[PDB]
């Protein structure tokens, strides 16, 4: 299922483990200074009708090495089978002063392959 | 700072602990006072924010499954903590539901929330 | 009730004419006063809304180019009109700027705006 | 290069004209299925390799049907060889205000000429 190593369109790598508790843990990454801790949740008892499995996770972009004062959340679903995929939409927020709060959040989409 | 209980306009509250390791752990109560409405929250925050008056970036996730219900969906909030006489967390959120591939175009809602401590 | 002059929280102002056509035309003054801050807007609205209490779906676009300035980007607002004496337009918006392909992942901001008449 | 006929990732077609004044005017076929489109684009884009920013709106009402909804697409045009439009979109339906929180969907679409 979801546990394993996933790659997106643009080279990022995420190694995740799905607990039976609905917990998601892993890293978004190779080299230490590019690795960040992730945490999230997923639906551990999805519908049995062909629907995907809902899930979400967060990465705060601060590690031992660097800090971009920002965090990304990904919301999407796992679709299993032949080529398993995770289709997501994401929000990136940066810490801003009150003056720039209007432009603090980027939106995008990502697809991961196992 | 972030550690505490937070309420929105609209009848929702959450209790959270901001760990020194950048972890966010807590429980989200969808309907204030309703015990079957409690869900695990887990997220991350910037544990060393800028000292230039900028807020503190964060995010969390709730999958809407608990002992009592399962809505087959998950919400993620992305935003920032703004300290003040009245502290706030300002967010944008994405709620994704499980769908078949054909209905994927309609699986994700977007909105915004503001919580006050 | 849509036709008229609207203001948001940030002190942007827009003036719209709502056509029976379902056309929305007018100008968006991101500032107040100056020609230099004035841009064309165009959009569309549901000109035969449900009469069950639900609001009126609408959308419009501004490209941030005028004869004084060009920010190489455009914003789209998607929302609905709630009529009556305390009329309001609640929106979510997307701002996209021109980028290279390599940099397209950071080209679009999302946010929300509330307008009052 | 924006003027023309564009096709998305399964079905939908649109025909648009890019006016000298920054206007986009056209027709969107969501498969009786034809609707008015209107928008704006950057008529004087940077010459540094950057795409052309744009946006357009469709309200889903024509003389045959009405879904009490409107979609806005925001994105950019990428010219040359494999010219395309990459967009993200917001779909808002009229709702009562108790149901406001669930009025707006968000997505992405890519168009080809």
Swiss-Prot record, chain A:
Presence of the UniProt keyword Signal in the record: yes
UniProt entry keywords in alphabetical sequence: Biotin, Secreted, Signal
Superkingdom of origin organism: Bacteria
A Gene Ontology molecular function term of the record: biotin binding
Binding annotation for biotin: 28, 36, 74, 90, 102
GO CC annotations on file: extracellular region
Sequence motif: Cell attachment site, positions: 41-43
Localization (cell): Secreted
Chain ranges of the Avidin-like domain: 1-114
Record carries keyword Cytoplasm: no
Family to which this protein belongs: Belongs to the avidin/streptavidin family.
Subunit structure: Homotetramer.
Record's function text: The biological function of streptavidin is not known. Forms a strong non-covalent specific complex with biotin (one molecule of biotin per subunit of streptavidin).
Protein name as it appears in the record: Streptavidin
Covered range of the whole protein: 40 to 156 of 183
């Amino acid at each position: 299922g979801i546990t394993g190593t996933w790659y997106n369109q643009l080279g990022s790598t995420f190694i995740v483990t799905a607990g039976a508790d609905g917990a998601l843990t892993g890293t978004y990454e190779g080299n230490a200074e590019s690795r960040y801790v992730l945490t999230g949740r997923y639906d551990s008892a999805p519908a049995t009708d062909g629907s995907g499995t809902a899930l979400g996770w967060t990465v705060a972009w601060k590690n031992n090495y660097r800090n971009a004062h920002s965090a990304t959340t990904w919301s999407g679903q796992y679709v299993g089978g032949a080529e398993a995929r995770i289709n997501t939409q994401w929000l990136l927020t940066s810490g801003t002063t009150e003056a720039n709060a209007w432009k603090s959040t980027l939106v995008g989409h990502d697809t991961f392959t196992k």
